[PDB]
Amino acid sequence: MSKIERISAFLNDKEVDMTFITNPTTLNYLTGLAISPHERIAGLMIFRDSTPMLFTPALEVEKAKEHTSGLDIFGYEDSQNPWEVVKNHVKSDVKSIAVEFSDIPLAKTEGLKAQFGDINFVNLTPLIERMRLIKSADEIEKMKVAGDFADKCFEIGFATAAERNGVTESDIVAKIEYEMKRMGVPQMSFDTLVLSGARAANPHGAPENVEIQENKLLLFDLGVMSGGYASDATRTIAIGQPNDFDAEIHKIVKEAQQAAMDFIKPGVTAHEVDAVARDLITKAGYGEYFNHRLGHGIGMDVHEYPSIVAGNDLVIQEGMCFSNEPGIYIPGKVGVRIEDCLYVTENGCESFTHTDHDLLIF
Amino acid sequence: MSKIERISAFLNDKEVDMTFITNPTTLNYLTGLAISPHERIAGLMIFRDSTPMLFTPALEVEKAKEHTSGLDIFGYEDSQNPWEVVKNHVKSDVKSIAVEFSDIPLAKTEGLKAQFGDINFVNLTPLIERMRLIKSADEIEKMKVAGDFADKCFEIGFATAAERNGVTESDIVAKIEYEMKRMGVPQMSFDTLVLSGARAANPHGAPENVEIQENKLLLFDLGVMSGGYASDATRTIAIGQPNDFDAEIHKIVKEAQQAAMDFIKPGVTAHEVDAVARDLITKAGYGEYFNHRLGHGIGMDVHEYPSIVAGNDLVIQEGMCFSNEPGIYIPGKVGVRIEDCLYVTENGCESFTHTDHDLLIF
Ligand SMILES: [Mn+2]
Ligand SMILES: [Mn+2]
Ligand SMILES: [Mn+2]
Ligand SMILES: [Mn+2]
């Protein structure tokens, strides 16, 4: 039964009067409508036993009532005090409101207190996070579209680097984001990374206007937003023939990531999935250089639940989405990472990106 | 008054004990420290008669003394509770705090209340907007740098559309932003607009993957961020030879804009600046199709003060920075806008951009 009926069940169980939801991502997940309120006010109000209302600026009202359903919509003009309009549409005794503690600024809560009195505010964010851990088949299709665009990014990026003739890290970044803009993509899901040689072992490194080094490795970490959903992936290639040491580090990381991918299925635990990759790299003598958890969740944002880390005994179940991204980073010498995100099926998993994992030579 | 002296005199006049300033653009504006703190806590604290203090995360502590002087800097470890460090470091009594009411979220004012008690909060933002309304000489150099980048975008945009061969509005936008990226520009200051023929008359049109039209006009509205400051301009050209109706509409807009630039100087009012261009368009027979104010302010953002609009009797002063952008939009037929931003000198004004204003044919 619907997300809205789940939130309304929460309110009765905890004896809270209504919500006032403000985050534009949450608003899109819950209503289907992507709204950019910027400076003005917009809120979603859900009750224990009454029709949910949706309060927007006067200009967005008609757009909103063609592209949502089940909602009671009304608005306000710059000539009005918005909290007075809201007050004129709620005629009950409000003594508690559920809001999102990390998003709602002081002006909104004070403006709200000025009408309904001395409110007791309750945090709604933990329940929203929990509803997002399991994805529907409809959600997984959209994330598959974002994955296809991440695969095109690699082909364009490898080809741009192989032309040499003075090409730099920033030159390659710009060319990649040029092609995505041409195909209609609205933005990247995080800052695009292209790092040459020893520069790939720095955890704070950033693409700059430095020429890529011959006979060294090149790291690409990238991702896009499409239809409100995200993608994330990493691949490490070679520019000319590398030396024997750097090719052996790449083999270790490669086999470690494929072993975690052949192990994931419902019934195992997050701790166990981290351990497959980490034990393999530790047994080979490079444990002190794999210094972060194996993976993180993904969905509308690039960083959600669950956490694939030690000490987490959560049971993996069908529908979850998360990243699988081991690495070895050795300062001044070399750094390598290989990354996919995936979704969990009834007897296994499938990955969102398909580009080759081997050490290709350009 | 230095900027710090100005905040503190405010506190003595209003009987407030101290500040907790949190927005990173404000932080940069007041001290020269530009940091991106994500979810960790940073705060600037000024007093009525006592040395200012600055609270940052344990990382940023010594990159903070790189860029600031005269401030007692100190930090906190991820294993610590930040508001506790703040409470044990402030050894005077606090019952009231000045903050930025639009920026500071609920979790942070509740974190402060649990350490200091029942705080009375007071809004500092009206004062920052009054300090930002007049620009210093150093601020104007940086805005000129951002304006030159906008002239370079026009050179690139005209050339790309001259090539024809099926090029579209969205092809043209991608090439503009590609080139800015290669030069190290962090981002644009708003969504770039390229609109062809009758599509420029839509008040809500947007670049799309459709071929530009021969023998019609083409509109370019664009700007960048550089060094923490913004820019904004518009030009309108022709693709092939235009018709006589569209060329006379361009001439009317050209003269209206140039007329307002020769009028602006200290002493006149904002209402009078709007009327100079508006009367010219009205007397030529198209007043019904000039349906927005003549300009807005510019600085760190593109949406600040003063407002150039009927009814605003504010007096213009040396050092104010605003836009000058009349236009005519006739549904189904044509749209033209021409736009510069400017700074007011001791006896006139000067423009931030220099690209030609005439109707050029590519
Ligand atoms: Mn990644
Ligand atoms: Mn990742
Ligand atoms: Mn403007
Ligand atoms: Mn503009």
Q: How is chain A split into domains, by residue range?
A: 1-132, 133-362
Cα separation, B146 vs B298, whole angstroms? 12
**Resolution number, Å:** 2.3
DSSP run (H or E) holding B279: helix B270-284
Residues β-bridged to residue A225: A230
**Closest CA in chain A for residue B99:** A106
Parallel/antiparallel/unpaired status of strands B96-99 and B120-123: parallel
CB distance A87 to A43 below 8 Å: no
CB distance B239 to B213 below 8 Å: yes
Longest Cα separation, chain B: 75
**Inter-chain CB proximity B110 and A101 less than 8 Å:** yes
Q: What share of chain A is helix, strand, coil (3-state, %, to 5)?
A: 35, 25, 40
Contacts of B113 in chain A (CB under 8 A): none
Six-digit token string for A216: 């060294």
* DSSP annotation string for A176-230: HHHHHHHTT---BSS--EEEEGGGGG-TT----SPBPPTTEEEEEEE-BEETTEE
DSSP run (H or E) holding B249: helix B244-263
Cα separation, B269 vs B288, whole angstroms? 24
- Which position has the token pair 């790309």? B160
| A229 phi/psi in degrees, rounded to 5 | -125, 160
**Inter-chain CB proximity B174 and A178 less than 8 Å:** yes
C-alpha distances out from residue A140 to A261, A266, A340, Å: 18, 17, 15
Select from A265, A259, A268 the least CA-distant residue to A344: A265
Q: What share of chain B is helix, strand, coil (3-state, %, to 5)?
A: 40, 25, 40
What does the buried/exposed string (b/e) look like for B169-181 if buried means 16 or more CB atoms within 10 Å of the residue's CB? bbbbbbbbbbbbb
Cα separation, B70 vs B5, whole angstroms? 12
A182 closest CB neighbour out of B107, B109, B170: B170
The answer on whether B303 is annotated among ligand-binding residues is no
| A230 phi/psi in degrees, rounded to 5 | -120, 165
Most B-contacting residue of A38, A182, A191 (CB-CB within 10 A), to test interface: A182
**CB-count burial class (<10 Å; 0-12, 13-18, 19+) for A1:** exposed
- Which position has the token pair 């044990």? B88
CB distance B230 to B300 below 8 Å: yes
The dihedral over CA atoms of B61, B65, B66, B70, expressed in degrees to the nearest 10, equals 160
* Other Cβ atoms closer than 10 A to A54: 26
Q: Compute the half-sphere exposure of residue B359: CA atoms within 13 Å on the CB side of its CA.
A: 23
Cα separation, A346 vs A350, whole angstroms? 11
The answer on whether A339 is annotated among ligand-binding residues is yes
How far does the CA of residue A264 sit from the closest CA of chain B (Å)?
32
Amino acid at A307: S
DSSP secondary structure letter of residue A47: B
